[PDB]
Design a protein around this nucleic acid. Sequence first.
RNA 1: UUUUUUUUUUUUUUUUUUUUUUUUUUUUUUUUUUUUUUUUUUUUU
Lengths: 53, 415, 52
Amino acid sequence: SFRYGTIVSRFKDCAALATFGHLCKITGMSTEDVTTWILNREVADEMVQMMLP
Amino acid sequence: SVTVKRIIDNTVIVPKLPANEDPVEYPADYFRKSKEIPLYINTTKSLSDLRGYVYQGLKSGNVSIIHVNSYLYGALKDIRGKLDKDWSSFGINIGKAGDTIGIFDLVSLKALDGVLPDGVSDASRTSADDKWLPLYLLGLYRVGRTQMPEYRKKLMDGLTNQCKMINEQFEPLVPEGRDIFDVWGNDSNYTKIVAAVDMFFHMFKKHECASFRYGTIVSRFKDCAALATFGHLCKITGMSTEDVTTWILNREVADEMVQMMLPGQEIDKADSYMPYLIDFGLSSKSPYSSVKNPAFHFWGQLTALLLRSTRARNARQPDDIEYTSLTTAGLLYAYAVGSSADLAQQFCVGDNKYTPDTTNAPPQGRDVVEWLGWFEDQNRKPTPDMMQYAKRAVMSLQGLREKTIGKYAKSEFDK
Amino acid sequence: QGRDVVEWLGWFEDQNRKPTPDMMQYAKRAVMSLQGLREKTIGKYAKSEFDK
RNA sequence: UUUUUUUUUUUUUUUUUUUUUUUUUUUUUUUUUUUUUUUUUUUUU
């Protein structure tokens, strides 16, 4: 129960990652199939940055 | 239907929903086990004292239900009522030729031994016993049934009925909302007293004390609304019980009808135990309720409405029935009766009219097969003419309540 | 004719996988004249989607 | 320097209750919030 309030530290300012998950569940597409619909240079860039191994 | 399979990987799934027993219980199938109906009149001590016990108790406070029961049995112990011909129901004999049977000529049996105040109360109250006090105690069962501001409009008609060569006043003061005298409804023995009062005076309509009936009337056919709606449909369509039966066009309405028309139930009998099946504790789940006839209730009451019933306006819309399928059925029936007027000459002066004298034109009369054939040829979809009939029927209905069939019907047909 | 999935899917095919204008009117009718409905319900969702 | 759901987790998710019911229906009645004595412009000479 100590989680209520301690929960907003989890993925704190990792919102971009969260919208990638969300975009998948809405389009219902695979993670890779969503990746292939990225059509702007600076959106590809950010994706590369977000996915570094 | 048995086997269903997931097509992606050829594996067998079995679809299943939770059980639902809670089955019906017929009047007849009860007297198969017991021959009597137990009336547990607890205390049988001092009848004059009880009159004061209930009077002072009702005058704001917690009057015991055990008390009033003991009172009512004492006050209504009039062995009046000259039996006209013969009285028998479900095998139990009650009357013969010229018998002088009273109102409690079904079982009495003594019970418990715990009483409240002890002995002689306040000798304050005169006779005026049987004259009005029993009417009131029975009259609170009528008022107790409801739960909307209609109470302070049905209790108003209680007080004005205790003046028939009487004229007194009132008793309690607290608003209802289920708290005061509403406890009594769930009393097996109290309800049994009310049901035996209604039954006695349904037979002895001419009797002086038959005024007790109004207040105890709401027990006759309690939880038998579906049966009432079937009668109403016959009256409003003008068709016979057989014809109406043939106009059932949904599988689950048919089932319900069959359930209701079980052969050995004495439902068409003049003076039977059947209408008091609930309050005499003969049944824990009426076969005849709206709850157990939801498809039939909706279908019957929707048609009734399209045909210009004023009752139906305010009927409850049930849950978990096929509204779409049911509604289009009801429409066909109403449209058919509303088109085909009966209209035949009845009287003459040696001068009669004889009836024998375009393509998508509706059938001549009110035969199901003719209309069924016509609906097929209409692509199994309701015509513009019948949709316009349904509109005209529902528009200009005013102030219809939430969750009624009237609200459903205006909303469906008058966009 | 009936209520069979294979059959209705084949008819949906014939309508290049997009809902018909009669279908849209059907759902329109089914949702218009729904009264006060609260936020984040499938009621609110359906009226927004089908009543415009 | 931030962060950028006036999002947030623990299950959950009819401002759903099942006890039976369900016309804010009771009709014993009886139903112009008609009534009789003419009369029948809130007409006058």
